[PDB]
Amino acid sequence: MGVMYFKKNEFVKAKKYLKKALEVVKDLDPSSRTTISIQLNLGHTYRKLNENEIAIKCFRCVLEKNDKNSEIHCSLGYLYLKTKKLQKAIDHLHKSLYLKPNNSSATALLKNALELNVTL
Amino acid sequence: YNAYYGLGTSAMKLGQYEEALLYFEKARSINPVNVVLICCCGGSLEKLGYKEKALQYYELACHLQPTSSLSKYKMGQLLYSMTRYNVALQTFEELVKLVPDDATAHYLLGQTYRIVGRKKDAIKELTVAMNLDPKGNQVIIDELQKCH
Amino acid sequence: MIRRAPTTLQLSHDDVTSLIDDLNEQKLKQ
Amino acid sequence: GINKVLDHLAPSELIKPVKSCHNKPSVLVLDDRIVDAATKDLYVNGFQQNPTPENLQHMFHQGIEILDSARMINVTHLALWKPSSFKLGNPVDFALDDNYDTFWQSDGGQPHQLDIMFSKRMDICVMAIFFSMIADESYAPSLVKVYAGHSPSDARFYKMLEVRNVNGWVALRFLDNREDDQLLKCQFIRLLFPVNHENGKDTHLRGIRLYVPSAILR
């Protein structure tokens, strides 16, 4: 329900439904590819909801539970470059390039982050 | 910082001067205490066209390391390009004091002396240059008949 | 029961292009 | 303005002086027994009994560094190569490996062809070929004709090369086609080896290179 409301460009009810999904599964089974999807979709909704702090928190949680994830590191680079945390942005972006050298957007993101850091 | 320096060099050899400068500034920021990183970044800046900022960075480098032969070589080259031979003279003098056994220093010292106009200094330094090395004597010979 | 793998949200290229552009005019502002 | 530019694109009466071309194919002399300023420009290793192969391997190197000593850009590896036929022993890699010991050998019809077709428009200026009269007399290239063109469709004759005695790198800069640019502008180059010395059959190629114009930390 959260995913379909997100796809329907109606994020507010998607956010509440994914929050309900998280709170139902919060107490049990942190592993088993369920909490991972819940937290990832919730972080995506928050980043599309323009609220970044809790999105970064959930992305950090899933990165803790799974480090082998190029998409996660690209998302952290996105969120950190949205804010002015350039060091974390470039670190996670380099991690993503390490995870997958041939990333289309990540090259441009790295160029922009380096240019902004130098000009800062 | 070694990765940053390598990226800057790789951008430099391909002609992307502004990108190479972009890497080199970060390389400096990682390790503020350096000399040849300073020199390479300043060379990138003068490739951009910012000669004054390149000179300021070069002066910061020479202040940080008073004994740096390559830095002094860069001050000499840049001052020769900018027609500041009055101070370039003492730069080459201190440089040839630092390195007495290299024919390149004698060559540039004699060339600067000839440009200034001291014929005796130019001929003496060029004679030392040919005595030290015959591999590059082709240019040294030309500097001979030009002065003579 | 064979539970289906839950669908996951992806970071689209359009939104990241929009954000990098917005950052470009942001730095161009001052 | 429309008319005047068309006249520039299509100069009708301005160009043709007399229409009196000889129409014969010009032949280039490669002999290294005569010393001349023009020959020294095209022949690099210098005029000289037959040197032993170790001198040939030796002189193979200074000819490389002398050609590489000048301000020049090598794009020999920036194009696709397709010879007439292989012999399953050595592809054209051993011809372009810049090693005298290794070489590429073709095996097939007598008019051997070597194709050098480019991906992008690159303006070649200096053509470098190494020959070994004494090391490879049996498979020495005696007769060389270089083509030019923008495609396999429009390949056309450019120059004539008769080989009598050359143990060394041969430099071939192009001035006839463009006197203003002093360089060649084509995307498609092919070479033919229709006959060898002393009525040979096959042909090697010790060296080949392509030239175009344009302290540290570990």
Side-chain angles (χ1 to χ4, degrees), chain A residues 1-110 112-119, chain B, chain C, chain D residues 1-18 20-47 50-100 102-175 177-218:
Chain A
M1 281 265 188
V3 171
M4 62 175 318
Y5 284 165
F6 174 95
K7 301 286 280 295
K8 258 155 55 175
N9 277 351
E10 299 210 45
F11 302 161
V12 57
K13 312 152 291 313
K15 169 214 165 188
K16 83 200 206 72
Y17 279 167
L18 293 177
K19 181 64 65 67
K20 185 161 302 171
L22 187 153
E23 71 93 18
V24 169
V25 192
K26 174 143 211 193
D27 46 336
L28 73 165
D29 189 72
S31 65
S32 177
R33 186 272 303 278
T34 302
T35 62
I36 291 318
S37 286
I38 291 312
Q39 286 196 329
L40 166 78
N41 301 328
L42 187 153
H44 275 282
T45 56
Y46 283 174
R47 86 174 176 89
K48 300 271 201 232
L49 203 41
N50 292 318
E51 187 195 346
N52 65 342
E53 160 63 25
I54 316 304
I56 294 169
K57 184 171 290 295
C58 290
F59 275 125
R60 284 208 75 81
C61 294
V62 291
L63 187 139
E64 297 155 353
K65 289 184 184 192
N66 171 254
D67 213 0
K68 184 33 52 192
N69 45 8
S70 68
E71 182 65 27
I72 280 297
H73 281 90
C74 183
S75 170
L76 276 296
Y78 189 74
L79 270 175
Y80 274 124
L81 185 60
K82 172 154 161 286
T83 315
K84 301 289 101 175
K85 306 296 293 295
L86 277 76
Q87 178 55 36
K88 308 302 289 193
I90 63 169
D91 275 356
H92 279 141
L93 199 40
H94 294 89
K95 281 279 205 322
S96 194
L97 277 296
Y98 181 76
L99 303 184
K100 172 60 149 71
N102 313 274
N103 269 316
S104 62
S105 70
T107 61
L109 277 296
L110 188 60
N112 191 2
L114 181 63
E115 189 172 0
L116 178 59
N117 186 268
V118 164
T119 57
Chain B
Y1 74 107
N2 276 20
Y4 278 130
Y5 165 78
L7 269 183
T9 57
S10 284
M12 184 63 72
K13 46 152 291 183
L14 294 174
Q16 301 96 31
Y17 43 100
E18 61 86 20
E19 294 293 328
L21 166 65
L22 198 73
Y23 307 106
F24 270 107
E25 298 155 275
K26 186 59 177 185
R28 184 179 295 113
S29 64
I30 292 299
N31 169 42
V33 182
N34 195 286
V35 298
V36 188
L37 290 175
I38 316 290
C39 290
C40 293
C41 185
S44 67
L45 260 183
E46 64 89 18
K47 289 293 281 292
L48 268 295
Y50 287 166
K51 271 76 180 174
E52 304 287 333
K53 293 161 76 77
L55 275 166
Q56 294 140 26
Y57 284 163
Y58 279 11
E59 191 75 18
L60 284 173
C62 79
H63 185 195
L64 183 62
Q65 186 77 9
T67 51
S68 49
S69 87
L70 278 297
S71 78
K72 287 192 40 82
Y73 183 75
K74 300 293 290 319
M75 283 74 75
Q77 210 279 345
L78 202 65
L79 294 175
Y80 182 76
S81 85
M82 81 155 288
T83 71
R84 183 65 60 84
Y85 319 117
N86 273 309
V87 183
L89 266 187
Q90 69 93 26
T91 65
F92 310 131
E93 208 65 34
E94 184 54 43
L95 182 137
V96 302
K97 284 185 172 67
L98 289 172
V99 285
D101 296 327
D102 58 349
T104 310
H106 295 285
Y107 171 72
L108 55 90
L109 184 64
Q111 180 164 67
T112 316
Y113 272 134
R114 176 59 192 90
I115 296 299
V116 168
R118 312 179 192 182
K119 300 195 166 194
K120 60 182 182 293
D121 288 15
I123 62 170
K124 184 182 174 192
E125 298 310 313
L126 293 173
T127 311
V128 170
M130 62 201 79
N131 301 337
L132 294 187
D133 281 333
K135 277 75 64 180
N137 63 4
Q138 295 82 12
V139 189
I140 297 169
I141 288 160
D142 296 350
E143 294 294 328
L144 283 178
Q145 70 274 16
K146 181 279 177 168
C147 181
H148 294 89
Chain C
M1 186 65 204
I2 314 304
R3 294 299 199 75
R4 174 74 296 179
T7 178
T8 62
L9 295 174
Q10 293 65 0
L11 190 150
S12 70
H13 283 337
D14 295 309
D15 189 19
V16 69
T17 300
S18 88
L19 183 142
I20 62 170
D21 279 32
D22 186 74
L23 185 44
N24 308 131
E25 292 84 4
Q26 183 64 254
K27 41 172 71 172
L28 186 59
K29 183 82 141 203
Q30 70 288 348
Chain D
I2 297 99
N3 304 69
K4 78 173 178 63
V5 300
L6 282 169
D7 287 305
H8 292 171
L9 282 72
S12 174
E13 77 294 327
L14 172 58
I15 283 298
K16 323 174 289 181
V18 294
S20 167
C21 189
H22 52 63
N23 295 305
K24 64 98 176 178
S26 81
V27 179
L28 174 58
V29 172
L30 277 296
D31 200 284
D32 60 349
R33 293 275 87 84
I34 51 171
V35 189
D36 200 358
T39 71
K40 183 51 65 203
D41 191 317
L42 58 88
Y43 185 74
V44 180
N45 290 116
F47 320 97
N50 53 359
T52 187
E54 292 82 3
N55 296 115
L56 310 178
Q57 177 75 255
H58 181 74
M59 62 79 70
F60 185 76
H61 294 88
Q62 68 273 16
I64 289 162
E65 52 77 20
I66 281 164
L67 294 175
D68 302 333
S69 76
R71 180 279 192 179
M72 172 55 87
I73 297 93
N74 181 20
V75 291
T76 315
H77 312 85
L78 273 299
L80 189 147
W81 299 54
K82 270 171 36 153
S84 75
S85 59
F86 295 100
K87 66 100 170 180
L88 275 299
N90 47 358
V92 293
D93 295 332
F94 290 166
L96 58 88
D97 62 359
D98 305 337
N99 179 24
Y100 165 77
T102 55
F103 37 79
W104 155 84
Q105 180 52 67
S106 66
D107 176 30
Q110 183 65 41
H112 283 140
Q113 68 88 29
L114 192 140
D115 187 74
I116 299 174
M117 191 225 78
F118 279 82
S119 69
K120 300 289 94 175
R121 179 60 169 293
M122 283 73 74
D123 301 329
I124 62 170
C125 77
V126 166
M127 187 66 204
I129 301 95
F130 178 81
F131 282 160
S132 67
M133 84 182 64
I134 54 170
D136 196 41
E137 184 68 27
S138 78
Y139 293 167
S142 63
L143 183 63
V144 187
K145 287 182 161 67
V146 55
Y147 286 126
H150 282 331
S151 179
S153 50
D154 60 354
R156 272 192 164 81
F157 188 100
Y158 176 77
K159 206 66 164 293
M160 187 66 203
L161 302 95
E162 183 156 60
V163 176
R164 323 150 192 70
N165 45 358
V166 297
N167 285 306
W169 280 101
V170 175
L172 201 42
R173 38 177 52 75
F174 313 109
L175 73 165
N177 50 4
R178 294 166 77 93
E179 72 278 16
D180 43 0
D181 285 346
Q182 187 54 247
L183 55 90
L184 191 146
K185 296 178 69 71
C186 292
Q187 282 192 167
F188 181 78
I189 295 93
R190 45 181 297 215
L191 294 174
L192 277 296
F193 311 100
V195 74
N196 301 315
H197 280 273
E198 70 258 16
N199 191 0
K201 185 63 146 172
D202 304 309
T203 303
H204 288 294
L205 210 44
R206 317 304 295 283
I208 181 70
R209 211 79 75 73
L210 277 182
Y211 290 160
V212 298
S214 64
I216 59 152
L217 272 67
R218 196 168 190 82

